[PDB]
Amino acid sequence: MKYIQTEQQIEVPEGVTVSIKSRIVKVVGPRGTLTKNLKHIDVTFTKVNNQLIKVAVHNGGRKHVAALRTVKSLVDNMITGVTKGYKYKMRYVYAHFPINVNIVEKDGAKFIEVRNFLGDKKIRNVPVRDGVTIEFSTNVKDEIVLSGNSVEDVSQNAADLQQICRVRNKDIRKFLDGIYVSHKGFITED
Amino acid sequence: GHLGFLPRKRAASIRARVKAFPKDDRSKPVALTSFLGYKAGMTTIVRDLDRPGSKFHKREVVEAVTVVDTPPVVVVGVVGYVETPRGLRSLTTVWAEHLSDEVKRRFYKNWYKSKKKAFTKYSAKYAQDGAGIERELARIKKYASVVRVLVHTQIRKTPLAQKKAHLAEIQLNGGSISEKVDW
Amino acid sequence: MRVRKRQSRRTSTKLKEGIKKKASAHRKKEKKMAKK
Amino acid sequence: TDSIVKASNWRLVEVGRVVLIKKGQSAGKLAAIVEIIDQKKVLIDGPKAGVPRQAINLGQVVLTPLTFALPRGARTATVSKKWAAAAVCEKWAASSWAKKIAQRERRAALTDFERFQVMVLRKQKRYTVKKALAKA
Amino acid sequence: HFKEYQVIGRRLPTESVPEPKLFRMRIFASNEVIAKSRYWYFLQKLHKVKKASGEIVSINQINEAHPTKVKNFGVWVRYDSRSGTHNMYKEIRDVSRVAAVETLYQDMAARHRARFRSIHILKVAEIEKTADVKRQYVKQFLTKDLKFPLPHRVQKSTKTFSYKRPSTFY
Amino acid sequence: VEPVVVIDGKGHLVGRLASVVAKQLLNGQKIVVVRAEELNISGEFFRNKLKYHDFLRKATAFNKTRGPFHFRAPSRIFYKALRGMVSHKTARGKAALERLKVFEGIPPPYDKKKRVVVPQALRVLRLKPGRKYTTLGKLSTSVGWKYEDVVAKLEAKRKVSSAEYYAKKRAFTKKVASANATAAESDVAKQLAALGY
RNA sequence: GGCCAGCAUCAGUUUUGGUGGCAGGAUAAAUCCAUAGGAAUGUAGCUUGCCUCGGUAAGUAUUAUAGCCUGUG
RNA sequence: AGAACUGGCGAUGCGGGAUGAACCGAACGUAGAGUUAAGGUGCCGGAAUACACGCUCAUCAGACACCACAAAAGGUGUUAGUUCAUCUAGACAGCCGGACGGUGGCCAUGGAAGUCGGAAUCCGCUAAGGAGUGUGUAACAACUCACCGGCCGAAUGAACUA
RNA sequence: GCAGUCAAGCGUUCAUAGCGACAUUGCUCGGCUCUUCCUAUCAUACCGAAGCAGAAUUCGGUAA
RNA sequence: UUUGCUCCACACAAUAUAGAUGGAUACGAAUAAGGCGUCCUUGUGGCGUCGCUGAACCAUAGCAGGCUAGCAACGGUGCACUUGGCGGAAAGGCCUUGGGUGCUUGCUGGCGAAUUGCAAUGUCAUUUUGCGUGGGGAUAAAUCAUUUGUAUACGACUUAGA
DSSP: OOBSOEEEEEEOOSSOBOOEETTEEEEESSSOEEEEEOTTTOOEEEESSSSEEEEEESSBOHHHHHHHHHHHHHHHHHHHHHHTOEEEEEEEEOSSSOOEEEEOOSTTOOOEEEEOTTSOOOOEEEOOOTTEEEEEOTTSSSEEEEEESOHHHHHHHHHHHHHSSOOOSSOSSSOOOEEEEEEEEOSSOO | OOTTSOSOOOOSOSSOOOOOOOOOBTTSOOOBSOOOOEEOOOEEEEEEEOOTTSTTTTEEEEEEEOOEEOOOOEEEEEEEEEEETTEEEEEEEEEOSSOOHHHHHHTOSSOSSSOOOSSHHHHHHHTTTOTTHHHHHHHHHHSOSEEEEEEEOOOTTSSOTTOOOOEEEEEBOBSSHHHHHHO | OOOOOOOOOOOOHHHHHHHHHHHHHHHHHHHHHTTO | OOOOBOOOOOOEEOTTEEEEEOSSSSOSOEEEEEEEOSSSEEEEEETTTTEEEEEEETTTEEEEEEEOOOOTTOOHHHHHHHHHHHTHHHHHHHSHHHHHHHHHHHHHTOOHHHHHHHHHHHHHHHHHHHHHSSOO | OOEEEEEEEOOOOOSSOOSOOOEEEEEEESSHHHHHHHHHHHHHHHSSOOTTTOOEEEEEEOOOSOTTSOEEEEEEEEEOOSSSOEEEEEEEEESSHHHHHHHHHHHHHHHHOOOTTTEEEEEEEEOOSTTOOOOHHHHTTOSTTOOEEOOSOOOOOSSSOBSSOOOOOO | OOSEEEEOOTTBOHHHHHHHHHHHHHTTOEEEEOOOTTOOOSSOTTHHHHHHHHHTTOOOTTOTTSSOOOOOSHHHHHHHHHHTTSOTTSHHHHHHHTTBOOOSSOOTTTTTSOOBBOGGGBHHHHSOSSOOOOOHHHHHHTTTOOOHHHHHHHHHHHHHHHHHHHHHHHHHHHHHHHHHHHTOSSTHHHHHHHTOO
16 A cells, blocks of 8 residues: 555664664674675665664555565574574484585685485585584584574575485485484574 | 588688687696697507506507697797787787798798898897887786787798798796796 | 567457457347347 | 664655745745645645645655744645744755855846856956966 | 536426426536536436436536645545446545545546546545544555655756766755 | 767666667767666566577578677677667668767777766666666676676776776865865955856 | 849738736635634643653643634624 | 448548558648648657656566457455454454363274264363364374463454456 | 256346356277478486385476 | 889868867766765764756857057966876877977057948868978889699689799
């Protein structure tokens, strides 16, 4: 029905600060900084009291308002990305052949080598995104931990790590072998 | 037939020019990318084959090879090309001041009737401290994204009754254009 | 991809006039069917 | 550690927003948005400027950066009351925009001899300004 | 552009029946002649009469009472379609009844493809009290101290060539 | 008004751009569109690409060396959009086109020269916010053109030199604007004001 | 006295402006003014809640230190 | 398909419909001027990239035409409606909890406790809970929703029409 | 396909002036050779579903 | 080639111009944003200001712009010599260092214009040349014919020979 004014409220905690010109967003805080281009979206930001932010769409159809809420979600995801952080725990299971996951650094690329998956001579190289850090879980068998700031970096890398290990031309029901996101969460629990 | 090899027509010259060149790495040492000679010959070789996985590993293979005659190519110039939205564009060529009888022959269709007055004013253009030659060489080093070498063949050292050598253009895949033009 | 054949929007004069004859045929049917 | 959000700042269409009519019978006169009808149409009246109270498109009009305190649905006399009390006419004349409009109108009604005066005066002003430069 | 007309008719006075009931209605039209024709068209549908059986007694232009006060109108419309005829209630915020029915006719043509001959305007009424205004797109403008901008404005060129690279600020 | 008229075909709209160039000619006005690549169209990428592609599918069946010459270069890509917009088989046409000049990027002596725009073919104005347009640089590349990069490179550098020039300019301007202000209230001055100037 | 022209005052056909007088309608409707009632997206005031000092909020309050609507002239 | 009456073409140029046997306009001597018809006004192309309210985004849109054929529909495209519904005794969404005992109702049968199946499908207790909505175990359990109830605070829901 | 069973609505009001979609229930001139094109693809390429243990396969999607 | 050919100067004829008649007056990017000015914590920074059209800005007064008398200020501009730096995207142009040199309408004087008869583009632009001048500069190849055979219907190609 073409809304005259639609707004959302991005709540800013103490530790972080949000600097926006045009449609480029800083989230500067404890863990680090995050930046995101949004010049595709066509909104208007309003800082009301240095702790609350108001996105705004004037004269927007249902399609434009559908964009309006996703800005609030993405900017908030950057905020929780800096305050709490993101921690994705991937558990890899195998029937017979032991999967051998290691981190190599050829030409400064910081790849993840996935060796011996289902008894396979191919050495799977997964690129590691700029801002995601990989460590292995101590005292828990067969677990790889993905942690950083951006949701896109951590989650897309988690998706990459499990789409290289496709069970090809076989069963789903019989062959359990693969790497899987066991837990999506935050670095600092409260 | 094969529709790629069309139009199936007679070539522009016997010396076909090389259409593409090996890429370029800007850390590699300066080295030539193409060479020329005169193909004439064919002969049989035997060799023991150290090709593992084959039916002829640690066996002997007879095979046909060809002998191209290749006298030592002589450098008589350099070309610099600027990168344009229209392709490449030669802005400056520079020559060797004193060239052989063979290449001054390449510049004429009728050799014997001529006064052989080819690069007389160009060699007289050199005749000082350089000044203009170093100016054109600065012109090449300043601009010109790729640098190709003008060469020719040693036709007299080949048994051919032609006497007339072929000019060519050979790019350099040694990095830093400075090292290209100074080579 | 191999972009497939596009349908024309040029209506030929035989089509256009035949459209008019088919239309007027639908009228004569509709006037008769209105009586029953 | 501040949350600096550059805020794009517009001229909002509101009750008491003074406007300038581009085209029509009025054309170049000021009026005040008395009441907002819908997204495209407003209700305007400038009694001192002489424009009658009318429903107009916002395509026909252009918003000016000045505002004043007007209660909604104000009849002509109330508009004239708040118009004179806020003195939006003198605030209009003070702005660069009214000076630019008056500038074009002054150049339009210039005589040829007056235009020749401008010829001579610009020659004199040029001389002293060119002497003012080539010093620093 | 429209005009409201009070048009009356009383099926021609004959023997034994003097002074019939004078059927009065309000007709929106562009001029007097169209208003008269529309009135006869409506009379033939409201009851069983004809153009030749009656007479236009009075045709009068109804000027709007307060063409300076913004009103909240509610228009009861019915119109012939691709299928059978059907009722419709659209709410229009405008200054005058003529201008409100004008915006309706253009909207009916725009959203429903109905021309002038199809539309039967039943009743145009003022909605006196707000929060009784039913439609949400009209109630959208009845909020307290409504301040909305017009972002992204076009600057109308008088020439073909410009020397600025235009700034669509507001 | 000028002898030549240099258009900055950036963020424009091929169509409305061509059509405003076309007639401009036929009326004998010389014109030189530049920055063609940066030109614009209308509609989600793929859309156009799919479009052109079908055009790139039309060739003289029996001898494709004879049929529709498909041009990539953003220029030509926009010369065909203006061509078929001018009786180009007559003489009055050939004579028209002949005073037209499309350039991908901005070369001399056009660089060091004022360059206009065409409001009626400006995408920003024409188009409605939030509606996919399709730059010209992309389409071109993803269909044959192979000089996207170079230009880019040669364009960035062409700006720099430009920037600096400006800088120098803004300065010398300031200086003159300050001296003038200091020339205010001087009989002569005073007077001019009364005569607007 | 031949070829071509310019201006003026004219006549016929026509195109395009500027300005005056009237007459019609609800003797326009409006606006404006005077009067009598009302509610508000509630106005000044008054009461109240909890705080960044006085802002906001939830009642009253028919305009009082904004105004609006309707009715009659 | 058969009659009647009617136009048009035929013995008829010209304007338009890009093009043309039947489509729209049109009282043909030779010229000048003005005004128009049908059709049009982005450029080709003479004439407004006029004005005003709207609707549409199409992975080959559409410009088309008694709105005629594939045409009845499908669609979590979008905008208008209509008719019934809920709603500050708290609407929709959302999690948190209860979601009961007769009762593992009868036959069935190795094992079938609501959920392999065959028939009724009843009582009580409440705020409300079906001889049970699906997942589940061999059978149970456990979870789920439909039904309520707790914070949450204004709109929302269904079926049709365009 | 014929007849019936439902049956969104419409019938000039409207189910008892009648039409009525998907289902459903009744038994029952031919051939030799080349060029180009189409996809409605047999194989080759990549996918989805399938009691798909592996192998083999069946159906389906993109694909000329 | 009886100094044939090119390049500078002025000189006369010709030849044309899809069409000079003050000036094509250079940031980039964004549009739900920018430009400029100032200031500082030197930043996606504060404060001020601007647009809403180039309706601008720069140039613009002299027999189609003559001749002269000055006054004021170290400016503006033309011309040719000249120090470099810069420009490769079609660079073929852009700034700069200076000496000379006319002119300046910044302001004020004195002469001259007419008869082109009341208008008639009233010719002042820029190409492509040729014949004359008075100075610089530069000292060929190709084809045929013969041969060659890496080529070959003929052409063409590759060769060879003072």
